[PDB]
Symmetry: C3
Subunit: 444 residues, 3 copies
């Protein structure tokens, strides 16, 4: 929607504003249960295609129960020792293993299929019964299987049993190939009917309920399913859903690109790049910063992010966009001598860093070339433009309409004397390049 973008010619960066936050800060857990029956041996002469057919669909059942039994018996550096995403789920699994805890769940779901249960560790969980394979196998099936002559009446029972068993096998293969933990949340793990029902009874605001149920596909991508326990005629697993404790605060995206002096010969040029690119959202008097790509998902002008993937910075960090030389926040940059041509596709446009003999242009599919980029760091709005070419590579601009603004100014690389420029700083900042230069100039 109302999205705007500013490009800063001086620092070769661009900021996309107009977005609104939805940052995960809490976790909600609920317990999904399937009712099982513990059928062992069925003394039955078979060979009759119909009996042999239902015995092998019964074999799939015992194989999945067994497979589940085998599961239950057992700036980016700053984000590596982050811990387990599923701790609050695992906390619920520990409790279901306590004696009689599964028994509490069964009795709560004996009369209905959805009930609130107070667990023994203080968390109040919503519990669902999504499949009753127990009373199907015990009632509408097992009597036929417990006389020495076993003759199923009609093939309809073979098909009815495959349909009942089917969801259990879909749930088991997902846990199998994923060591008991799956994300995103399958429709098989939680159907849309059950997920909206769950969201509606969450201890959250009507604001958060309406945000979640308008983007169920995003809630799935940020939820986990955890295989839990399989005892006492019950299968249970924990669904872990996000809670967006930060809502509707301003978010902005920083795009950066290498800024270099413009001599055509390679290596005789000094470069400089802002390293603080990523997503920024205001969050409790500070700024939550998301440096990693694909840790935030955009929908129109709403940003969903998980604060587990963020760093906290002082809110002054945004001063680097408007005044990189400011004395309130030391803005972070890297330096090099690698003048390779490249383009960054922003929200409402494109940044192009053209160096050497490279051919960099911006085109319209019907009109031809609309801008030929000179050497240096320039910018184009996505209005009237479909593609950007850089060397032999074709980039596609985004086609969303917004307000673009070009803030002219001198490239700050021009302020630096190349004879005393620290030209291989992996992770520095503005005043760290200044104090490194102040040493060299005093050596003279």
């Amino acid at each position: 929607q109302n999205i705007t973008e500013e490009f800063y010619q001086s620092t070769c960066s661009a900021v996309s504003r107009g977005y609104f936050s939805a940052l995960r800060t809490g976790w909600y857990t609920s317990v999904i249960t399937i009712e099982l029956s513990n059928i062992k041996e069925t003394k039955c002469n078979g060979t009759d295609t119909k009996v042999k057919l239902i015995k092998q669909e019964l074999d799939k059942y015992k194989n999945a129960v067994t497979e589940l039994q085998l599961l239950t018996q057992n700036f980016l550096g700053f984000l590596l020792g982050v811990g387990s995403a599923i701790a609050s789920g695992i906390a619920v699994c520990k409790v279901l293993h306590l004696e009689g805890e599964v028994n509490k769940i069964k009795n709560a779901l004996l009369s209905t299929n959805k009930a609130v249960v107070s667990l023994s560790n203080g968390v109040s969980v919503l519990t669902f019964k999504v499949l009753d394979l127990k009373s199907y196998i015990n009632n509408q099936l097992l009597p036929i299987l417990n006389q020495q002559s076993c003759r199923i009446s009609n093939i309809e029972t073979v098909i009815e049993f495959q349909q009942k068993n089917s969801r259990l096998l879909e749930i088991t293969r997902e846990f199998s190939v994923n060591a008991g933990v799956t994300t995103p949340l399958s429709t098989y793990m939680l159907t849309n009917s059950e997920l909206l029902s769950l969201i509606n009874d969450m201890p959250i605001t009507n604001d958060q309920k309406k945000l979640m149920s308008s983007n169920v596909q995003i809630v799935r991508q940020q939820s986990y399913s955890i295989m839990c326990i399989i005892k006492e005629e019950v299968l249970a697993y924990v669904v872990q859903l996000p809670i967006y404790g930060v809502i509707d605060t301003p978010c902005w995206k920083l795009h950066t690109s290498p800024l270099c002096t413009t001599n055509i010969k390679e290596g005789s040029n000094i470069c400089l790049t802002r390293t603080d690119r990523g997503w920024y959202c205001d969050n409790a008097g500070s700024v939550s910063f998301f440096p990693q790509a694909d840790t935030c998902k955009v929908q129109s002008n709403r940003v969903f992010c998980d604060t587990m993937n963020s760093l906290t910075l002082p809110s002054e960090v945004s001063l680097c966009n408007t005044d990189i030389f400011n004395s309130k926040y030391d803005c972070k940059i890297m330096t090099s001598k690698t003048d390779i041509s490249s383009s960054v596709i922003t929200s409402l446009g494109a940044i192009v860093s053209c160096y050497g003999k490279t051919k960099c242009t911006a085109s319209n599919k019907n009109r031809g070339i609309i801008k030929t980029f000179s050497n240096g760091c320039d910018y184009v709005s996505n209005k009237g433009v479909d593609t950007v070419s850089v060397g032999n590579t074709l980039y596609y601009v985004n086609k969303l309409e917004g307000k673009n603004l070009y803030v002219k100014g001198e490239p700050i690389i021009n302020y630096y004397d190349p004879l005393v420029f620290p030209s291989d700083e992996f992770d520095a900042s503005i005043s760290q390049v200044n104090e490194k230069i102040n040493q060299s100039l005093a050596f003279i």
Copy 2:
């Protein structure tokens, strides 16, 4: 096939030549459609296993339509702001949302199952009808379901309806777990029969058609499926297939490994590594360079790559393989003091960098050890050799026959005086280490 490899003792690198390019430069889009019926409520007393069985298979149908409805309502740093792979597909989705555009498609496919359609934005698309669930549900099914007493005749209709519905549910779960965009291209999204049919009618050369239909498995790995629209008794989604606009130009792979001085004691040695490893293909008077691992897939002597993942370099870049000190291209290297033993498996052999007390050897499973590597950077051909051991780690050489060549020369690390060697350059080059040394030598 005719593959050759050169190892350069002087720069501890190896080049595998003999390959031929297939670089994606264009995108082809076609519209796949499934015909739907908009059945809401069926007033039917059931309970009879057969009727209740077909009502729940009908429930799966409405659940998938709903799930699709929920989707439609809504050197490596130089490759991060690259944009959307699926822009030209999304451009086609925007058009199908225009009024009457889906109506154009329906009428084109009313008489046949494959037809060319001219869309309203100028792109001529090939359109497929792969499933007609409309006329099945409306004709061979719904009459039975619209009298107050509903009795399906035979179980065959329950099974026939599951088979018809089945592909729709397979397509919907893939879009569900992937937020409406999937890659590689499922056989469920596009069968081999439909994909070869599509390739045969593409606006491309008989050369490109024969290349694509000889490697359908690779075309799948480089294609996208995009969920699009679900209105007016039609489901439609866009398949986006690659176009290889660069074909049969020479490609070569650069393998690099750390080159260091050979004192056994750790840290008292200086190291130096070429950083320009990856794939290189000639491309329109320049060289397309693929620095990222797994962005190129090899089949015999053919390299498939996506130019979206490349950088453009001057063709002079290959001079670094034969003369790293050349004055036409500043060859890029890094420096360190980290002499850790390691091996690189090349196309037709292995590079071994052996330092310290490490045991590095090359073996034959029947003959024993064939080469024991001294300290420094050495190389072995894959003829008569199965494995390379480095410390406690076993590497397996590739078993393809080719021409190996060993270019003797002095390790360039020996040319550098260690007392004035910039020994922690993250991203430098030959003449940047030279000018950094020229400063230190004048300080004296």
Copy 3:
């Protein structure tokens, strides 16, 4: 189980001990085979729902055979040219293509479903026959399909044929979407019954057999399935299972975090971080080091790792934990001026690096805040603590009981004069910062 952890206040690191190794060093291969029939055209008038229903399930069969036919016709930098994980499998595929080699397998499995076969390249393989689609289609099905009038008797045969065909289609779609190589090992590729049977007949110790069959889910995550050959009425593919040649040696995990001087103003502080974090296991007189995250999977106090992902270091490397200034191993560190607050979740606790105005605390869900962290690098045990907060981010401590130990000492960053501190070392070491300082101090 008996897990202990030490935190070193001086170097801002923590070591989790008590673990025991299971490192993959060998590969076992076996050949799984499905018996096929090469049915081409069946001259049959149909239209009868039952015949048309079995003809399309027969179509799925030929489509999967075709799809398989299309497949058969065709510190972290030190780990990039590692080679192919599946070399020893591919070596077995080459042999099955030799003339009469598939014929050897068929005759070995003509009388039973599991047999040892001696291949022509010297490897003795265990061979399984998991599905006999040949004699089903040829005997219990094809006679009905080879008179001009084709009338299937009962719908039971349609369902029986779907069940037989079903596993073949599950195997084919996995190979399809994965270019003939899949990991982890599907239950569809190898059932739990077949996998335990295979492990029991492996040429390995009763120790290794009991370790593997107690963790089948881990064996799956470290195994590969390779599509191989489809000729002469046989489908065959190779399963490649790990062999743990290193068992029960001590493993320990190193956790590191940035250590910095504690002035609140940003950038005027020098930092220093140990870069050697990861897993370490004793291995044949040396130490196997696993720098990459998620290349080791933990179960209670057992560590499963693949030595293909490791480096070999001298066993002296562990001296850095107890004496970072030691003269036997040059301990590796990086330096910067980036004092951003962050926390590392260790095995039995949490490391917190608190800098600037950031609010860093450790909480109990019932008691409130239990520790407020001062500026600098501190540590908390997981006893009585559930969460750690750093700025706006909530981290969850692990809830396993163990022995924690806090080794007090002075932060080594305090030993360095900031006026001559090389404050942007990407990959250095203790004595490399010393010799870099010795130059600056002599310049004076």
